[PDB]
Structures are given as structure tokens and as C-alpha cells.
Ligand binder design. Structure first.
Ligand SMILES: Cc1cc2nc3c(=O)[nH]c(=O)nc-3n(C[C@H](O)[C@H](O)[C@H](O)COP(=O)(O)OP(=O)(O)OC[C@H]3O[C@@H](n4cnc5c(N)ncnc54)[C@H](O)[C@@H]3O)c2cc1C
Ligand SMILES: Cc1cc2nc3c(=O)[nH]c(=O)nc-3n(C[C@H](O)[C@H](O)[C@H](O)COP(=O)(O)OP(=O)(O)OC[C@H]3O[C@@H](n4cnc5c(N)ncnc54)[C@H](O)[C@@H]3O)c2cc1C
Lengths: 481, 481
């Protein structure tokens, strides 16, 4: 019998498990589907971030970046037989698998070296308010291979890729399978408009076969739904500048496998096109799925488990965190949600995660780092808002040759008192720069004590402390006042 | 007759000139020695930062970095005939000269397009409390070619390299001449311990001739006098890791030119060595020099002009800013000093520059970004101090091959209330990361609202918001309490 049984050894799952076991000395079962990355279930010990998420994509984006470095290197005097220069995809995913495997191996020890923490390999199902079966498959008919009795249950099952219902959806892949491709596609279509789609458009672009061609397609007007309007048009420019097709207002209607292994994707938008690989990145959805929530009587709001500020469901000894809550779908938010749950329930203080003003980044080339409100929302929340905008091609990029690489730095402000509502930047080092800006925003920085800080010269970060005067306003409507 | 005559079209000089002329509509003379970068006087319109300072070194460091990128690129699958791969120094300094020349050309227009602003080419000398001669040379005997009568004078002459008094100092160069080398030295000795020396050790290392060898020598115990102790040992490691000789407690006694053009540097430390180029980077000193300060009766404290908070001398219509004040020798501090001078004297408000908590960076490979107090000083100012330390080899650098490349992130704290006193980091992207941390420190961030901010994953910046528990203390002495 356990104090806590955590369904899913994820980012938030494994955090709450360790914090309960080690800090409050509780007895903890952690259940996960498998325990080393890759097919059939792709996620394993460590969750989605470690196996088919952040950790492998940033290695893969970092690798894709080296094609920029090898290019613009020439402008600073660096010469070599660029005829000779080719990218070895097999090596990339080979070192990736290694790195991800060890994160897996180390979590093994963590369990294999700590009281209270124990791991059951299987599929967690709710049998009651407080018994949970480690069954042998997703199908709740499959053999039970453990029933854990417990006093608390934590649902941290995460979220899965969302596939459309399309003629021939069978012939498409996901984020998950993309990480295990034997080789890079020649013609790719990443379906979807934001983040995972545009991040993977970067990676596929760099490791493609020279006569390869990448086509990001979005059924929107502009990619990255939900990001600051200027970052979206500028990234859309510099993505096409590096030669990735961006098809807006086009959506797959039917993927039919033609002949040679080719795929003919007819868009509902009339068009038909030929690809070697179609990757669906249209969404992610809570793995509410095979949890048997009704067995305990747990409520879904929509998609995933509905959960309050202190992250607990209707059922009083059950709580939920991370992606299955369908809150903010980010690893470090889920780790915080997790940390504050045990501090609340096995601890003295309650504790709730501040889901506001969370800084984040898209690792496109070049990247985006962003924090706080976008223009178009703050204008609905505040009476007069001031937008500070700064775009420039960095000198290093005039002499590098990627003049198309503009740096956008935007600061939108509640003009009525000067509190910085949101900072947004696109450009190399955007994600690193934005971290300090997240601390600022949770300190309630004014624009004044942005431009009043002495800059670090020469850096692109110093641009934030150089923005004194507004560029236009929103006095309910946009007004260069 | 002028309102203001600014001796030196520097970073601070040109800032105060423009702010007076344009904002307060004053009549302004700006005098500078020459008006395009390079020998004989190396500085020109734009000052030291533009001509023989920040702008050219960061282009040159950026170029030197590409040797890392081409190296560790191979680990992410990127292959090419690395036998073929060579660095073209001539191209580097060729594009540098271009970039720096245009900053020069644009300042020309700025004068050539603005009322009040006018530039006199020459050497500024104080004749009185308020007449200043544009003479034709440094020597005050040389022909006067203008006397400007004026109601105010601003001394912004900057600072020059400091050379030791050594047998054969004639055969050594400086920062200045290093920017104009026809070609990269094979054997180099950068004399000095910090910043310029170690930055140039980076640049020389990357563009050297493969059987070339770089030797940084410092008469100290450890390079970068004045930086956090951990950053110093770690950078000293990773500098030698990339193969630059670091000779501590060794100092040149006599540079004698031997034969073939070689130079035999005997160290006072017994040792004798052979080099192709000796660069002196032992210091910089206020260009108080040929200003004729006595003519007005202006006071030097030590080295440079002594000046109060509001940046004015004993003589009541004379003020001084930047490097000749021997305050903080940084461009953006001098631009601030400048901005606040005119706001004080041609403006309503006074205004003084906050010389505390100024973030800065050394562009070594890898770089350092730093802000606030170092451990060893705060322990003298505060009763109990907590030091938070985090060092790790980034995953990307396990798989890149530069495992030696450690990331150090240190946060030292007044433990008595938690106010962050100083943050210090070494590692790629250090300078960009530190900028947000400078704004934090001037907001008076506590350690709590560092670790209470949600991180941006995966970035090395997020490491700052992951440091909760201290590592040791100083309760007057260092105490793992
Ligand atoms: C590609 C891609 C890129 C991303 N990039 C980023 C990024 O750069 N930065 C970032 O911050 N976030 C990123 N994310 C999001 C991040 O990976 C997730 O938000 C985060 O890991 C969520 O953690 P979690 O604890 O909710 O669950 P997860 O970490 O997703 O783990 C849930 C786990 O439970 C197991 N499980 C599920 N069903 C069952 C069941 N019924 N029985 C037992 N166990 C079960 C799963 O197999 C899995 O291991 C990325 C996601 C993808 C996919
Ligand atoms: C190599 C090297 C690297 C540096 N790197 C950095 C860096 O990365 N970041 C940073 O922030 N700072 C850097 N600095 C420091 C920075 O360059 C200076 O602090 C800053 O430019 C000082 O500005 P200033 O206004 O005092 O004068 P300056 O900009 O130095 O200009 C003074 C000017 O006056 C002219 N002048 C001098 N004597 C006379 C005279 N008697 N008559 C007329 N005119 C005269 C000079 O020729 C010169 O143009 C660097 C310095 C060097 C050298």
C-alpha cells in the first residue's frame, strides 16, 4: 500500500514522485508504459521532454544550426572545399539516441537507489478512488499485472500528438516517429502552424539532400498562431529566405500513397502535391485516453482532467499536473505544478503555480524568445498601451551574408503606469536573452527601469535597455498618438 | 563662440554633443585628432570603441568563434574535408576595416546634417577657463589652426594603452596596432592579465598558422584580476584546453630584437623566450596627457581628471566624462555619464550615473558575463553571505566533443534578507544572458524571485532560476555552515 501512485514517469510526474519520497519521506509508486525511449510507445522513463521532446529536438536543432555556421563562416575568412561539405543525418540521430538513453539509464538508478520510489512497468488504469492497476496493455481487458492500493493518486499521463481524420492519415507520421527516421526525407510536408511544425521544418531543411525541399503548410493566414504579429511575419520571411516553402491557407484533405512509396497529398484547397514524408503536427491532446477516469469519477473539462489552482480533481484524493491538465504545456511549468502539489498535500503551506508571465522559446532558425502579453490582448485589457519596436540587421550579419536575418525586439507596455506587459524577440540567442526578462516581468519591471539599465556592449540583448520612446499606441484602437 | 566645446568625438563625447545640439538646441564644437580609423592615431571620429575597441574586436572574436563551430560541427553529423579548412586573416581585417570605416562615414553626415554640431579636425588644448585651441599637433608648439571661445568645455579625451618601461619596449605593439596587422603572428605573447589580453589571445589563437603558438603571460597568480574566483580558474582551464599557453607569475624585463625579426623576451622571472610578436596589454590610462589642464587649472586626482557625481571639475565651466575620469572604463557607462551631463547643465533636472551594478562581459572563448559584487568583497560588506554555485558540462558539449567547456553560474547573496549581490557566469552566451540580470539587480531582486521564475527549457539561462539552496557561506569567513 502506497501514499502516492503517480501515473506517468514524466517531467511533472517524476518531480512530484521524488519530492514526496525524498523530502517528505513518503512511499511512492511510479508507473510508466516502457523504460527506454523509442518505438512502440516512444515515451518512456523521463516522459515526453526527454525521449521525444525537448532534449532530443534541441540536439537536433543545434545540429541543424551548424549549417548556418558553416555558411556564414566564410565571410569572416574561413575557407574550405564547400563542395566537399555534407550533412550526416545518421550520425545525428545516432548520438541523440545515446544521449536520450542515458537520461533513461540514470532514472533507473534513481529508483534503484532511493527508498519509497519504485517503478512499475505497464499501463496505469484507475480501478477506484484508490486502487490503480498496472495492467499489461492499453486495453483494459489485457492482463492485470499489479493492483496498487494507495491513499493518493497523481495523474501525470501527459499528452499525445493529435492526428486529423483524413483519407490516408495512415501514411503520415508525427513528432514521435520523426525522431527515429532511418534517413532524412527529400520532400517533406510538415502539416501544422507553429512550434513543433516550424521547429522540425528547420531540422529537416538542414539535413535534406540538396535537391530536397521542405514545405511547411498551415491552414492559417500566418504560421505560429498566437505569437506577436511582427515575430510571425519576420520568421515567415526568414524561413522562406532559407528556402522552406510556407503554404498558408492550405490543408490536407487526403493523403494517398502513390506507387514508388511517394505520397500524393491533395489539399482541400484544390492543390495536389507529391511528398516523400508527411508529418502531422496539427496538435497535442491530453492522454486522458486510457486512464479509466470514470472508474474513480474524475472529470474532464475539455480534452483533459479538470483541476483547480491547487491542481486537484473532483475526487478528493486524486490530483493532476502537466499536460493532462491542458494548462500550459511546457516542461518547467509541469515541474512547478508537480513541486507545489506535494508541498501542498504532503507539506505545511499550500502552493500554487503562477501560470502567468511564463517565458518561452521557439527553436526555429532563427529562434524566438517571448514573455508576457501580445499586443492584441493587452489592448483589450488596458486602456492605453504603448508598443516599443526595434528591428535591425546586425552588423555581423551584413558581413556574414545573411542580411535577411533581422533582429526584432518588441516591448509592449501598460502606458498608464509603465509596467512592461510583454517582451518579444526574434533572432539568434533569443531564448537565452528572454530568461532574464522573465525574472524582470515577475518583479513588475517598468519600461523606465529597462531603459535605465546600462547596456552590455556589444550584445543584441542591450537593445532592450535602449528603447525609451514608444512607436505607436493602442487607445482602444491602434493609434500612432 | 560656442555653448560647448567637446574635446574628443568619442562614445561619451559624441553623445553629449548630439544631446546638447539637438535636444537643447545648443551650439557645439566637437574636436577629434583624425576622422577615419587607423594609423597614425588609430582612434578617430567615433572614439576608441568604434575604431580600435568594441566594434572591431567583436567582429574579430565572432570570426575566431567560427573555428569552434567548424570543429564541434562534426559531432552533429556535419562532415567536410577538414584537411582543406583554413582561416583567412586578411579577409577578416579587410571586412573589419570596411565596417569601421562606415561608422566613420556616417558620423560625417551626422555633423554635415545638423545645426550646432560642428567638427574640428585637430588636437584640442585648453588655453584658458574658456578658450580652447584646435592646434595642428599634440605638441603645443605646433601651429594653432583655430581658437574656440566657449561658455562650457567637456573633456572626453578617453584613455590610451599603457606601456611598461622596458629594454626594447619599442619592439612591442598594443591593442591598437593589433587591429591592423598585415597577417597573424605565429608566436605571440600577449602581456597582461585580463580582458583585452585574454580577448586577443582568443583571436590570435584561431587565426594562427597551425604550427603557431599563443602565450598569454601574466605577472599575477591567475588571469583576469578582479573577476569571480571560479570564473578565473575555469577560464584559465578552458583557455589552456584550447591550447593557449598561460604563464602566470612571469613578466617581461627586456624585449630584444634578435636577427631574423624574431624577438627574445627575457622575463625578470629568469626565463627567456622567442616570439614573433609581443603585444603589451598591461593597462590603459586617461588621455589627460596633452590637454593642457593646468592652463585652466583643472585637477587630476590620479591618472585622470577628478570629477564629482555630476561629473564636473574644480573649474566651474568644465566637466569630464568617460575614461579620462578614470571611473568605469566602459562605453555604455560613458554614454550615460554624457547623457546625464547635458540633462544636468543644459537641462532642468540634475542627473548622475549609477556606477553600481553595471553588467559587463569578457569576450573570451568561452565568454564571461558578470554583474554585481564578487564573493570576496561582499563578505567584507555583509555579515553573512550565501554563495550559490552551479557547474556542468552541457549535453550539447558532451556530444560536440568540447567536454572541457563547463558552464559556471554563481549567485552570491546577502543572506540576511536575500538580495542578490552579484551574478557571474562563464560559458557560451554568457554576455547575452547577463543583460536581463543587470535589470534584475537594479530592481533589487531577491534570490527567491530568481528561483521562483519558471525557466525557459532547454536554455543555459534557466540555470539561474534553478538555484534554491546555498553551497557555502561567509559568516565573516568562508563557512560551509
Ligand atoms: C516535440 C516536442 C517538443 C517539445 N519541446 C518542448 C521544449 O522545447 N520545451 C518545453 O518546455 N516543452 C517542450 N515540449 C512539451 C513537453 O515535452 C511536455 O510539456 C512536458 O514534458 C509535459 O510533462 P508531463 O509531466 O505532463 O508528462 P510527460 O512528460 O509527457 O510524460 C507522461 C508519461 O506518462 C506515460 N504514460 C502515459 N499514459 C500512461 C498510462 N496510461 N499509463 C502509464 N503511464 C502512462 C507516458 O508514456 C509518458 O512517459 C515538447 C513536446 C514535443 C513533443
Ligand atoms: C580593445 C579594446 C576593447 C574594448 N572593448 C570594450 C567592449 O567590448 N565594451 C565596452 O563597453 N568597452 C570597451 N572598450 C572600452 C571603450 O572602448 C571605452 O571605454 C570607451 O570608448 C570610452 O569612451 P570615451 O568617450 O571616454 O572616449 P573615447 O571613445 O576613447 O574617445 C576619445 C577620443 O578623443 C580623441 N582625442 C584624444 N585626445 C585628444 C586631444 N587631446 N584632442 C582631441 N581629441 C582627442 C581620441 O583620438 C578619441 O577619438 C574597449 C577598449 C579597447 C581598447
Amino acid at each position: 500500500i502506497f501514499d502516492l501512485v503517480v501515473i506517468g514517469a514524466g517531467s511533472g510526474g517524476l518531480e512530484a514522485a521524488w519530492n514526496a519520497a525524498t523530502l517528505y519521506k513518503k512511499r511512492v509508486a511510479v508507473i510508466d508504459v516502457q523504460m527506454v525511449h523509442g518505438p512502440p510507445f516512444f515515451s518512456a522513463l523521463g516522459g515526453t521532454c526527454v525521449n521525444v521532446g525537448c532534449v532530443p529536438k534541441k540536439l537536433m536543432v543545434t545540429g541543424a544550426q551548424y549549417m548556418e555556421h558553416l555558411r556564414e563562416s566564410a565571410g569572416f575568412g574561413w575557407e574550405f572545399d564547400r563542395t566537399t561539405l555534407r550533412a550526416e543525418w545518421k550520425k545525428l540521430i545516432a548520438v541523440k539516441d545515446e544521449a536520450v538513453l542515458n537520461i533513461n539509464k540514470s532514472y533507473e538508478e534513481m529508483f534503484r537507489d532511493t527508498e519509497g520510489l519504485e517503478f512499475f512497468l505497464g499501463w496505469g488504469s484507475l480501478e477506484s478512488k484508490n486502487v490503480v492497476n498496472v495492467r499489461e496493455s492499453a486495453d483494459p481487458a489485457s492482463a492485470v499485472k499489479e493492483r496498487l492500493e494507495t491513499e493518493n493518486i497523481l495523474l501525470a499521463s501527459g499528452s499525445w500528438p493529435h492526428m486529423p481524420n483524413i483519407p490516408g492519415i495512415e501514411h503520415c507520421i508525427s513528432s514521435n516517429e520523426a525522431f527515429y527516421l532511418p534517413e532524412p526525407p527529400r520532400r517533406v510536408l510538415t502539416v501544422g502552424g507553429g512550434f513543433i511544425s516550424v521547429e522540425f521544418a528547420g531540422i529537416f531543411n538542414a539535413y535534406k539532400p540538396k535537391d530536397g525541399q521542405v514545405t511547411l503548410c498551415y491552414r492559417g493566414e500566418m504560421i505560429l498562431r498566437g505569437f506577436d504579429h511582427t515575430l510571425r511575419e519576420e520568421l515567415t520571411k526568414q524561413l522562406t529566405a532559407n528556402g522552406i516553402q510556407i503554404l498558408t491557407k492550405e490543408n490536407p484533405a487526403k493523403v494517398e500513397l502513390n506507387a514508388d512509396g511517394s505520397k500524393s497529398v491533395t489539399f482541400e484547397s484544390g492543390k495536389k502535391m507529391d511528398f516523400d514524408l508527411v508529418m502531422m503536427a496539427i496538435g497535442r491532446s491530453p492522454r486522458t485516453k486510457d486512464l479509466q477516469l470514470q472508474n474513480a469519477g474524475v472529470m474532464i473539462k475539455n480534452g483533459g482532467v479538470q483541476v483547480d489552482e491547487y491542481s486537484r480533481t473532483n475526487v478528493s484524493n486524486i490530483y493532476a499536473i502537466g499536460d493532462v491538465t491542458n494548462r500550459v504545456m511546457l516542461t518547467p511549468v509541469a515541474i512547478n505544478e508537480a513541486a507545489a502539489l506535494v508541498d501542498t498535500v504532503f507539506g505545511t503551506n499550500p502552493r500554487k503555480t503562477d501560470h502567468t508571465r511564463v517565458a518561452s522559446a521557439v527553436f526555429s532558425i532563427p529562434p524566438i524568445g517571448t514573455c508576457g502579453l501580445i499586443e492584441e490582448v493587452a489592448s483589450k485589457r488596458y486602456e492605453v498601451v504603448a508598443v516599443y519596436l526595434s528591428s535591425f540587421t546586425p552588423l555581423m550579419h551584413n558581413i556574414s551574408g545573411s542580411k535577411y536575418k533581422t533582429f526584432v525586439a518588441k516591448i509592449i507596455t501598460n502606458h498608464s503606469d509603465g509596467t512592461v506587459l510583454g517582451v518579444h524577440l526574434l533572432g539568434d540567442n533569443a531564448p537565452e536573452i528572454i530568461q532574464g526578462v522573465g525574472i524582470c516581468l515577475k518583479l513588475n519591471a517598468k519600461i523606465s527601469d529597462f531603459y535605465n539599465t546600462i547596456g552590455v556592449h556589444p550584445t543584441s540583448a542591450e537593445e532592450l535597455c535602449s528603447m525609451r520612446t514608444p512607436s505607436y499606441y493602442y487607445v482602444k484602437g491602434e493609434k500612432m498618438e
